[PDB]
Swiss-Prot record, chain A:
Protein name: Actin, alpha skeletal muscle
PANTHER family xrefs: ACTIN
Listed PROSITE patterns: ACTINS_1, ACTINS_2, ACTINS_ACT_LIKE
Oligomeric form and interacting partners: Polymerization of globular actin (G-actin) leads to a structural filament (F-actin) in the form of a two-stranded helix. Each actin can bind to 4 others. Interacts with alpha-actinin. Identified in a complex composed of ACTA1, COBL, GSN and TMSB4X. Interacts with TTID. Interacts (via its C-terminus) with USP25.
Modified-residue entries (N6-methyllysine), positions: K52
Record has Hydrolase as a keyword: yes
Domain of life: Eukaryota
Modified residue annotations for ADP-ribosylarginine: R145
GO molecular function: actin monomer binding; ATP binding; calcium ion binding; calcium-dependent protein binding; cytoskeletal motor activator activity; hydrolase activity; identical protein binding; magnesium ion binding
Species whose genome carries this gene: Oryctolagus cuniculus (Rabbit)
From Swiss-Prot, chain B:
Phylogenetic placement of the source organism: Eukaryota, Metazoa, Chordata, Craniata, Vertebrata
Record note on domains: The N-terminal region is required for nuclear localization and the C-terminal region mediates transcriptional activity. The RPEL repeats mediate binding to globular actin (G-actin); each RPEL repeat-binding to one G-actin monomer. In addition, each intervening spacer sequence region can bind one G-actin monomer, to reach a pentavalent complex.
Function per UniProt: Transcription coactivator that associates with the serum response factor (SRF) transcription factor to control expression of genes regulating the cytoskeleton during development, morphogenesis and cell migration. The SRF-MRTFA complex activity responds to Rho GTPase-induced changes in cellular globular actin (G-actin) concentration, thereby coupling cytoskeletal gene expression to cytoskeletal dynamics. MRTFA binds G-actin via its RPEL repeats, regulating activity of the MRTFA-SRF complex. Activity is also regulated by filamentous actin (F-actin) in the nucleus.
Quaternary organization: Interacts with SRF, forming the SRF-MRTFA nuclear complex which binds the 5'-CArG-3' consensus motif (CArG box) on DNA via SRF. Interacts (via RPEL repeats) with globular actin (G-actin), thereby regulating its subcellular location and activity of the complex formed with SRF. Either forms a trivalent (by binding three G-actin monomers) or pentavalent (by binding five G-actin monomers) complex with G-actin. Forms a nuclear ternary complex with SCAI and SRF, leading to suppress MRTFA-induced SRF transcriptional activity.
RPEL repeats: 11-35, 54-79, 98-121
Region Intervening spacer sequence 1, annotated ranges: 36-53
Modified positions (Phosphoserine) in chain numbering: S36
Designated name of the protein: Myocardin-related transcription factor A
Consequence of substituting F40 to A/D: Induces a nuclear accumulation in unstimulated cells
């Protein structure tokens, strides 16, 4: 059947079109390597490395005949035409895929939401974007990038567990801290107030058992780490908080569609899984926007894979089973064809 | 009939090859495990029991709420009833893909947008 | 003054007391396929259990009952109704068999394979919560296996059809059958040499002899086609069940595959299940199959264990609670 | 080249040859430097009381006397099958092995569980044995030739004790037996006249009601003594250990518990295959009684069968013989070579 590969900053989610949720998810070869990053920031920088990643996906993870299945790939908002054309080239010449197609992650995330118009917040591992999309079209001039993503968050959590006396720095230790992040962290509704209450006691501090049995205990770090998303300054950045960047992104769009955008604010990507990030984003976006504005934040419980799922759903829709780029089309028009077919 | 010393010998030889391996018999909970202590299978049992009881009695207090599982995408959200779920979800995915189909199908050409004051030439 | 554990099986009631490490009573259809269909009949079964098997004052002991995966809310409510009004039990509670089996294993997260008499399920469970959307049913169970063994002993010339004869064949099944590691190969070896055939003495002294039937009967579990079913083999169904679960707990599941129910007692079923599940799963996946010796009664034991926890005392459904909220209460209390 | 079967009892060695229908030699298990067995009884310590070998020097002398004085054979020339008690400690078996091989250079040897042998002689591999000898009584459930340790029951009330209590109750009749010789007299009385009653209370009632119950017994010195309800009271001890001051349960109860301590699946099989062995099970009626009691304790829809081979006074040994005689069995002795190459440990792998 058709394949769907989401070539994430630090995880590849590859599966079979149709069914919900991918089959394989592995570090962006991969794990077995972990037992021994060519897409940091979201853009494919090393093509040899990447090619090896695709080989590992095709043959080791999904165990399939690349020549036998059409392949849908994901690309980052604002992927350079040259880049897409390279992906296409490699898929067709290095894998003789029957056909293929390239899609914008944010857009897929939106589709999976069951929409064609709205503003996506896609916060993965190495990069975070705001992508306003209208009738299935991403508005480039309004897209926002923000190199503050999930890894950075993990790091800062390390760097603040330090004030607690704990010293994580091994790659292994880093991973430990990552798990801690995922399990215990959470965005606070009111940050200053949450700090006040922090000192004020009761159920804030959690325990957490390291691999070697030793139990460490974590306090306000829980909500400070993810707070970085709203105050990049916490890790030294003059950038505006994800909410501000969202606002600006909306504003950088024609004024008619703005209502639509504020009422269809869909979140995707791992880094949006923090409990409360929704309500918070609501608070902030609400406070920046016109007082008579319908504001809705959409946070599907499975956003950790929004994109990829969309990828599936999309490639299922009878319509789309016409946009695919056939090997023949490619032979007759070269890589350039992508720009005409995928958009 | 009496159990003559020779006939007594044949039933035996025929029943001693009709016999499974004890490995196979603890394998089926007739035997206690070879390697444990012969006296003290009782206490041993008690003790592994305890171990388990303790685990359960703890893992129980910490038991999450359905809601929390749903937060995490463990259990589907949210109604209707266990049995329907399986299917209901398939209905959901189906109906959505469909509602998406025309939506993308009737997707304005670029110039619609441009003239609609969105995006440059 | 303690609790009673009652596992209402498709084929066999397992009843007893909280604490003990095995059901005191186990006895033999108003619950074919695992769901209570006839309530009068069932009520008689419960009466017989309470009064004839366990010889107890139903009004004097709290009662934990088992129910099948995906028991309809109406069903549980009915069980509750009958326990409280037809038996004035001090309190009671209803539990999911598969889940109990898992608890007895000493876990709260994993995927159970519960293959009893009239039905076989796959139940992925997480922290006590069975994930309905991923549960798998499979009406191919133990009875069916007995039958097919009869229907294949036929090719050997033997003709079992009496109910009594059926029972004979069942015993033969239990004593001699066994899942083979490689089926095709095991057939090849079947022909190659003897050493595979075994000898079985009927009640009336007459000795019959059994060959590849031994491993063909249970092979039905992996190829339902053997008895005419378009269903997938238990291993395949397991795989599918896992995959229908959130992608994150997948790993926990492949790593925590616990088997329960009588029909899982066949020697080698473990290693085989390992082979197959391994072959279907991602090549870098920890795969573990748990097959407790005590699994012909996994469920019930779990039940016991649970009904025995001091913690659990807080979650019984008291007669008072029932009076104040009706049968519906069950849905809020047992889950 | 013919094997020897030796059942080392708490009270009585039973030794002989594979094949033989009953043991050639049977002598007391006690010990100009050292007198063994009957000679010992003549002029002027039991190293296996309770069933477990406690004194190895003594025991070694017992084996020597068996090999050379009773069976008159070349220990180096015959494989030897020995019996051991249920739950004999691995160290113990290993010791027996060691001594057989190094102190007797036996060509080969093997160790077997008495109760199990008794069961085999019955012509079975699955059932629950009640072995009640001189110094100890066990319940051993065995399944497909395997004894289930966790369910085994011991009960230090055995035959000796019974003899004693018969003495201690013949006292109420005025008779005073206390000499070792007198003890032996009372033992003979026990064996000849005692018997388990079907209903004990009722049997007492009938005891008073009429005569016809009392019997007459002539002492060695011509004098005739007369014995009454003592006859059935002595053995009643087996069912009420309290009679001689024990908080233990009666053999029947212990049997029941032993069954129950087993897989529910196999219980039916245990109940319908209840085989009795050992001297102390020879009391007339013990079977029917055991039936009564076991029946009363068990589930009302349970097939219950008690097997009491009239020869059980030697069940074990016979079984031993039978087994040591199978062509099959020849492949699983323990050769001297095997022993040299693996030490006493080998026993645990070969005998079980
Ligand atoms: N429950 C969680 N809470 C917070 N962060 C999480 C959680 N689970 C995963 N993450 C983080 O999400 C990040 C990865 O998500 P994601 O898969 O979207 O990254 P990526 O796909 O590789 O990059 P991209 O989304 O840009 O393609 C990881 O850094 C991970 O630590
Ligand atoms: N050793 C064995 N090998 C194979 N099958 C066995 C064995 N022992 C029992 N069975 C079969 O297991 C089946 C019953 O097991 P089980 O008690 O789990 O059924 P049930 O409890 O009545 O139904 P359920 O498990 O769904 O509640 C019987 O059909 C029986 O033949
Ligand atoms: N006819 C009989 N009635 C009752 N008891 C008897 C009878 N004959 C012998 N006994 C008793 O049986 C006891 C011995 O039997 P047995 O030979 O089984 O003892 P043992 O073999 O030395 O010990 P073990 O059986 O534990 O190996 C003796 O105490 C003896 O008095
Ligand atoms: C469990 C898991 C999560 C993940 O997303 O991990 C991916 C991939 C991973 C690669 C190295 C790691 C040792 C291998 C596997 C971890 C994969 O790098 C990440 O963990 C980086 C490092 S810290 C962080 O938060 N992201 C992202
Ligand atoms: C004929 C006989 C029977 C017996 O079983 O006897 C054996 C062995 C005997 C040893 C001492 C005795 C003087 C020697 C031989 C008696 C052997 O002790 C016993 O009688 C003991 C003493 S009371 C009793 O009943 N058992 C057991
Ligand atoms: Mg992504
Ligand atoms: Mg069951
Ligand atoms: Mg003996």
């Amino acid at each position: 059947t058709a394949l769907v590969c989401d070539n994430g900053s630090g995880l590849v989610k590859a599966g079979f079109a149709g069914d919900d949720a991918p089959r394989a998810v592995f570090p962006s070869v991969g794990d077995e390597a972990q037992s021994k990053y060519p897409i940091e920031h979201g853009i494919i920088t090393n093509w040899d490395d990447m090619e090896k990643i695709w080989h590992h996906t095709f043959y080791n993870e999904l165990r399939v005949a690349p020549e036998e299945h059409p392949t849908l790939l994901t690309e980052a908002p604002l992927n350079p035409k040259a880049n897409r054309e390279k992906m296409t080239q490699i898929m067709f010449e290095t894998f003789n895929v029957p056909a293929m197609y390239v899609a914008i992650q944010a857009v897929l995330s939106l589709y999976a939401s069951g929409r064609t118009t709205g503003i996506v917040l896609d916060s993965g591992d190495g990069v975070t974007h705001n992508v306003p999309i209208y009738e299935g079209y991403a508005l480039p001039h309004a897209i926002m990038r923000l190199d503050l993503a999930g890894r950075d968050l993990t790091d800062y959590l390390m760097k603040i567990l330090t004030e607690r006396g704990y010293s994580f720095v091994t790659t292994a230790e880093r991973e430990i801290v990552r798990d801690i992040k995922e399990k215990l962290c959470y965005v606070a509704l009111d940050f200053e107030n949450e700090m006040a209450t922090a000192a004020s006691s009761s159920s804030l501090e959690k325990s957490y058992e390291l691999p070697d049995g030793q139990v460490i205990t974590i306090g306000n770090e829980r909500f400070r780490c993810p707070e970085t998303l709203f105050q990049p300054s916490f890790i030294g950045m003059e950038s505006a908080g994800i909410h501000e960047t969202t606002y600006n992104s909306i504003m950088k769009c024609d004024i008619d569609i703005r209502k639509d955008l504020y009422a269809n604010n869909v979140m995707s990507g791992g880094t949006t899984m923090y409990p409360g990030i929704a309500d918070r984003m609501q608070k902030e976006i609400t406070a920046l926007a016109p007082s008579t504005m319908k504001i809705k934040i959409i946070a599907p419980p499975e956003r950790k894979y929004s994109v990829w799922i969309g990828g599936s759903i999309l490639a299922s829709l009878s319509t789309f089973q016409q946009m695919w780029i056939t090997k023949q089309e490619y032979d007759e028009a070269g890589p350039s064809i992508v720009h005409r077919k995928c958009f | 009939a009496p159990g003559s010393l020779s006939e007594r010998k044949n039933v035996l030889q025929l029943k001693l090859q009709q016999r499974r391996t004890r490995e196979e018999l603890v394998s089926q909970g007739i035997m206690p495990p070879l390697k444990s202590p012969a006296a003290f299978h009782e206490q041993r049992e008690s003790l592994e029991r305890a171990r388990t009881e303790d685990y359960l009695k703890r893992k129980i207090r910490s038991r999450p709420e359905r809601a929390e599982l749903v937060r995490m995408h463990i259990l589907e959200e949210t109604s209707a009833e266990p049995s329907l779920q399986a299917k209901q979800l398939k209905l959901k995915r189906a109906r959505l893909a469909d509602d998406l189909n025309e939506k993308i199908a009737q997707r304005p050409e670029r110039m619609e947008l441009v003239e609609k004051n969105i995006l440059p030439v």
